Amino acid sequence: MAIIKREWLEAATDAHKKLGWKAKGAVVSAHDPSDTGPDAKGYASRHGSVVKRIAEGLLMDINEGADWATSLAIEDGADHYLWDGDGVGAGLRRQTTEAFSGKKITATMFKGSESPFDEDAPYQAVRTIGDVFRNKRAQFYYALADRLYLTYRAVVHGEYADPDDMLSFDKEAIGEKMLEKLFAELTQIQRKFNNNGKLELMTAVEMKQKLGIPSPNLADALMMCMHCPA
Ligand SMILES: CC(C)c1ccc(O)c(=O)c(O)c1
Ligand SMILES: [Mn+2]
Ligand SMILES: [Mn+2]
């Protein structure tokens, strides 16, 4: 039921260096907030197809967490910032826009439970995006998985892919310790049964309650930065 193979993640590590291409595009950052409790904060940032920061935030309340993440976005030179606005993050827009006052950074609330982005468009690579994915969480996790798989095929099987459709982890920038944390989370993201035959993923709650593993905050952050607002 897992959607991402560890082998793809290994291949994607420094893939831009292996295949000789450079990060090009917008810088997108995303934050997975949490209230004070067991669930850590997540932050991820990419420059185009190259992930450059993965960070985890401990011992913070929700507002401290948002301050931490917006500061990271600023440090990273983000053009776009997203955060998880389902549940506890629903009220964070005010603090977030305040943090970016005077800066050219857009802030977008990500709601993983909503219907997929552009749900009426034909599903590519009669059947629409909305027939395929239950919600945005599923849609953007599969976008991530698709990038990783294409990168794996390019790195390991020498199959050409446009760098725009790939994803590389900058190991030097991210750090080995945080990369290992991320990978342990990404390999636990799993499909759940859906009675309308759509792709749907286990929620953070189901993951910890049904099979006792910690919330994938770093993976959720990375997944949200797959969406580039405008
Ligand atoms: C209640 C728990 C498991 C939970 C719910 C929703 C989220 O968006 C989370 O990001 C999270 O880390 C934990
Ligand atoms: Mn969340
Ligand atoms: Mn979380």
- Tokens 């950052």, residue? 29
Sheet holding 27-32, edge to edge: 106-110, 80-84, 27-32, 41-47, 50-57, 168-169
Q: Which ligand is nearest to the CA of 202?
A: 1
Beta strands in 37-167 (DSSP E): 41-47, 50-57, 80-84, 106-110
Q: Which tokens sit at 77?
A: 């030179």
Region class of 96: left (phi > 0), else alpha (psi between -120 and 50), else beta: alpha
Q: What is the largest CA-CA distance in the chain?
A: 49
Cα dihedral sign for 93, 71, 25, 30? negative
In 3D, which of 204, 192, 198 has the Cα closest to residue 87? 204
- Tokens 């970016």, residue? 100
What structural domains and CATH numbers belong to the chain?
1-230 (3.30.420.240)
Residues 27, 15: contact at Cβ < 8 Å?
no
For residue 110 and ligand 1, the question of a CB distance below 6 A is answered with no
Expressed in Å, this structure's resolution amounts to 1.9
Q: Which tokens sit at 157?
A: 């099987």
Residues 84, 110: contact at Cβ < 8 Å?
yes
Sequence-ordered list of residues with C-beta below 8 angstroms from that of 74, at least 6 positions apart, any chain? 99, 100, 103, 105
- Secondary-structure percent of the chain, ordered helix, strand, coil, rounded to 5: 45, 20, 40
Name the residue with the closest Cα to ligand 1, atom 1. Answer: 205
- CA 27/CA 217 separation, integer angstroms: 20
Q: How far is the CA of 142 from the centre of ligand 2 (A)?
A: 17
* β pairing state of 106-110 and 80-84: parallel
- CA 116/CA 111 separation, integer angstroms: 10
- CA 211/CA 200 separation, integer angstroms: 17
Choosing from 31, 32, 34 the residue with most ligand 1 atoms within 8 A of its CB, the one to mutate for a pocket test is 34
Q: How far is the CA of 31 from the centre of ligand 2 (A)?
A: 8
| 133 alpha carbon, distance to own chain's centre | 16
The CA-atom distances, in angstroms, between 127 and each of 122, 124, 131, 136, 144 are 6, 9, 6, 17, 21
Q: Which tokens sit at 15?
A: 């893939």
Q: Which tokens sit at 123?
A: 């599903």
Secondary structure, 3-state, 58-85: CCCCHHHHHHHHHHHHHHCCCCEEEEEC
